[PDB]
């Protein structure tokens, strides 16, 4: 039970007919109806949107759907499945955005730089090796029970 005329055959030419049909069918303003345009990317003649819909549409407007942010009258958003709350938080940034990326990249670059500086130049208490008493802990290694008695001893200082 649905009319084929309530779909959207063909693009925006012509400018009387399709613009009139879009403004009457999508329940929209004439010029706020924004075609993409027809660039061979499919898309029919579907309207362009400002694409935010989440931290815009402030919740004290008290529209219809308390989580989907609808009002039951819209065209729809074309990528509305990518633009629900719990999917992509399209909030305004508290400072900027290139500020964010440049400060975060500079900080992480400095930390990895000093990580390399640490990794090449370590620290230690100044202490010789460990005095494993039996040919540097031999025969508790991989084995060779009589194959190679290896001459290595510790000398007192």
């Amino acid at each position: 039970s649905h009319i084929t005329k309530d779909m959207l055959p063909g693009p925006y030419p012509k400018t009387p007919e399709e613009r009139a049909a879009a403004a009457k069918k999508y329940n929209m303003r004439v010029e706020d109806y924004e075609p993409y345009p027809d660039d061979g990317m499919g898309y029919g003649d579907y309207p362009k949107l400002p694409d935010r819909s989440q931290q815009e549409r402030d919740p004290w407007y008290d529209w219809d759907h308390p989580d989907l942010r609808l009002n039951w009258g819209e065209p729809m958003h074309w990528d509305l499945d990518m633009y629900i709350r719990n999917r992509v938080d399209t909030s305004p940034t508290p400072v900027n955005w290139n500020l964010m990326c440049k400060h975060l990249f500079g900080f992480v670059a400095f930390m990895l730089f000093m990580f390399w500086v640490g990794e090449t130049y370590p620290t230690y208490q100044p202490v010789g090796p460990k005095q494993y008493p039996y040919n540097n802990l031999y025969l508790e290694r991989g084995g060779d029970p009589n194959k190679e008695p290896e001459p290595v001893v510790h000398y007192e200082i």
Binding site: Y124, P126, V127, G128, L137, Y155
Partner: protein, 119 residues
């Protein structure tokens, strides 16, 4: 300490470096200096399954410590004198390793600077 500051800011030459520690050969200034007592019974050291990197010097103190800890276990605060003996023996061994470092440091510094000032 100042060893690290000197080793990273001045020369790393006269300061010896870890994991390449024995630089001079032995008995250069030992004469007749080795005891290495070690009557800790290698076979019975295998027979008592110590942790690895503990089958070492001062192990007999750990043997007696585990012995009294086992044979009087619910006496919770029993074994402390042998515990301090084992700590003191590892203190002896740690001082001995520091002696090894500083002995190599003094040898390398003094003989290398003497021969490279007048050779």
């Amino acid at each position: 300490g100042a060893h690290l500051a000197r080793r990273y800011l001045g020369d790393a030459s006269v300061e010896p470096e870890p994991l390449r520690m024995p630089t001079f050969p032995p008995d250069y200034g030992f004469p007749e200096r080795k005891e290495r007592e070690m009557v800790a019974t290698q076979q019975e050291m295998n027979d008592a399954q110590l942790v690895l990197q503990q089958r070492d010097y001062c192990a007999h103190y750990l043997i007696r410590f585990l012995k009294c800890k086992r044979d009087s276990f619910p006496n919770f605060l029993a074994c402390k004198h042998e515990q301090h003996d084992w700590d003191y023996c590892e203190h002896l061994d740690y001082v001995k390793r520091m002696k090894e470092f500083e002995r190599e440091r003094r040898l390398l510094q003094r003989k290398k600077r003497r021969e490279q000032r007048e050779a």
